Structure formats: structure tokens, C-alpha cells
Amino acid sequence: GYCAEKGIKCHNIHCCSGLTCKCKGSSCVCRK
Numbered sequence: 001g002y003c004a005e006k007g008i009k010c011h012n013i014h015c016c017s018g019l020t021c022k023c024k025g026s027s028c029v030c031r032k
Contacts (some may be wrong), residue, residue: 006030 005014014021015030022031
């Protein structure tokens with residue numbers, strides 16, 4: 001039960017508070 005931080009890519013996990021698991025095209029990075 002954890003979350004990814006800013007810049008920490010994620011496959012099926014969501015970014016911690018303040019960040020959101022955004023994916024633009026074929027990339028996946030935690031963006032505000």
C-alpha cells in the first residue's frame with residue numbers, strides 16, 4: 001500500500017497526494 005512520488009513512473013499505481021498519475025501518449029510520469 002504505497003504511492004509514487006513526483007517523477008516516479010507508475011504502471012498501475014497512483015501518485016501520492018499532490019500528484020496524479022498522468023500519461024501522455026506512450027509515457028507515464030507523476031505530474032502535478
